[PDB]
Design a protein around this ligand. Structure first.
Ligand SMILES: [Cl-]
Ligand SMILES: [Cl-]
Ligand SMILES: [Cl-]
Ligand SMILES: [Cl-]
Ligand SMILES: [Cl-]
Ligand SMILES: [Cl-]
Ligand SMILES: [Cl-]
Ligand SMILES: [Cl-]
Ligand SMILES: [Cl-]
Ligand SMILES: [Cl-]
Ligand SMILES: [Cl-]
Ligand SMILES: [Cl-]
Ligand SMILES: [Cl-]
Ligand SMILES: [Cl-]
Ligand SMILES: [Cl-]
Ligand SMILES: [Cl-]
Ligand code: NA
Ligand code: NA
Ligand code: NA
Ligand code: NA
Lengths: 170, 170, 170, 170
């Protein structure tokens, strides 16, 4: 999948983060072997050598750990609707719908502005190498029987998700 | 998957909510046919006649719409750690790790209490019929070309996700 | 302030949680004496002997720590809007506005239902004694110079905030 | 208050956003005159002519509406803790505590890195003029008796809050 500006989003890393959360839950749920399976899947997803990880990097954002980079894992939309009289907004929304039908992203943004609607794109990001290290280290702790400590690292990986909300500039 | 109390969680409905969010994004991304495909997948997941939806119902929670019910779609954990001197907490955490290894949920909760750690389970819920109606109606609006209005219903479905955070009573 | 069902909400505890967050930030901001001042204010707010803390208790919710109770610190609204043709919804919303003008909460909920709008009340809660202990212990750690450890307890207090989202049953 | 880089944060705008949320709740709570009072307070806070609003602007972030700017209303911290053996981390945390005592922000960040801890600063931002317009227009709608529509604009103002999470570069 791609952002509004056509930059690639990592579905593998999104699924890895989902697996990380499920893994942590299974530690507390008394299913530590299931937790290891889920963390192992996350490790394979984040370290896939056939994936070109450069494609997902948000270059304009400094990661906390030296040499690391944030990658895009999801995009969503926030709209902000100004008050308009019912009639004027219907006609403006109808034109916005035509641009979406046409695949015209810029025309959609501009028609929505005439409807009093601003658009913000929320890009969910993770630091790639820091997340990889959390997963691999958590698995090592699980191998050692240090399950609570593994859970702390899985939670830290989740807490490293950030959301860059930006106005749409196509 | 199951909660700490062994109640079933709907992976299909979780994926349906993921599909609903992606569908809404694709409307703004100028890919309305992709949005319809994603909403159609969500509709099939939420309306699977081979699924016994009773298994996922949280019976002790009144849904906003008459006749409806909330279903469980995810569980996560929140811990709250009291301050303990480094030595006393290590020994208590080590015993908690043994109970997790043993699959002993109650023993895990009790050992964590000795470590100064309380456990809260966060159950993500959706109203099943209200969400079904949002998806089916959004698809109908997409068929009619009313894409912005479909996006509003998809967002409403997402805003209907609630999180019941409860202390663990096994 | 009060919930939709006229149960009291603690403005003091809300401000205490705000102070707890600011206190934690000031630790990292190199202003540990400011952090102590903010945590001391939170302690005074949560332990005010002139406040009748029973007024804010959500009795139908078991707190994680034995003998403790959750108290209400905020209420907000989530609406869920069904799709209605523009004309029918305007007339229904106009009637909802009259009930709000009249102070008629039940009539507002019922008029909104005719407009295709369901209402959910989100009650933010904290465990009172567990939060008190976090604050007092964090101050003690600050007195000892253990600032990072104090920050962990302040964060734990914040992570103990839960949101009970319930359909409106007046 | 100030960020880690000593940029000013608007306490007035933070309180305005708090007032906006309370105002919206009071509409549904059948207290429309209280909602107007709270929105009027938010309007006065955001439009204070004695405040130098330039002090709070995050210049490196484009606001959705032409001519507008994002302003800082809060800062918080996220830590990410690597796994370290208990002994090595205690000694590293003890040195971090000394730098916080000394007010040495850069030394704190560097000592925390030796403890395996990365620091992210989360800056809560609002678009100033777009938020002002939401509040003033919502009050006008309240004067007209269009309470539900006012609530939509108050919610839109809240949905315009974004969080810029950045690694600490002092
Ligand atoms: Cl297992
Ligand atoms: Cl890379
Ligand atoms: Cl580093
Ligand atoms: Cl290890
Ligand atoms: Cl398409
Ligand atoms: Cl059912
Ligand atoms: Cl109903
Ligand atoms: Cl329809
Ligand atoms: Cl200070
Ligand atoms: Cl009490
Ligand atoms: Cl207890
Ligand atoms: Cl102590
Ligand atoms: Cl009033
Ligand atoms: Cl300005
Ligand atoms: Cl504009
Ligand atoms: Cl107006
Ligand atoms: Na979206
Ligand atoms: Na979890
Ligand atoms: Na509200
Ligand atoms: Na903070």
């Amino acid at each position: 999948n791609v952002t509004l500006n056509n930059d690639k989003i990592s579905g593998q890393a999104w699924q890895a983060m989902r697996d990380i959360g499920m893994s942590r839950f299974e530690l507390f749920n008394g299913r530590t072997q299931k937790a290891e399976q889920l963390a192992a899947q996350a490790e394979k997803l984040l370290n896939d050598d056939s994936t070109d990880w450069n494609l997902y990097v948000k270059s304009d954002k400094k990661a906390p750990v030296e040499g690391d980079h944030y990658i895009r894992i999801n995009s969503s939309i926030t709209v902000a609707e100004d008050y308009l009289p019912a009639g004027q907004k219907n006609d403006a929304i109808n034109k916005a719908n035509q641009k979406m039908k046409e695949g015209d992203k810029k025309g959609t943004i501009e028609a929505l502005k005439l409807a009093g609607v601003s658009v913000i794109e929320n890009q969910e990001l993770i630091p790639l190498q820091q997340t990889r290290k959390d997963v691999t280290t958590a698995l090592s702790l699980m191998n050692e029987g240090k399950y609570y400590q593994a859970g702390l690292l899985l939670k830290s990986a989740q807490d490293g998700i950030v959301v860059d909300s930006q106005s749409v500039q196509l």
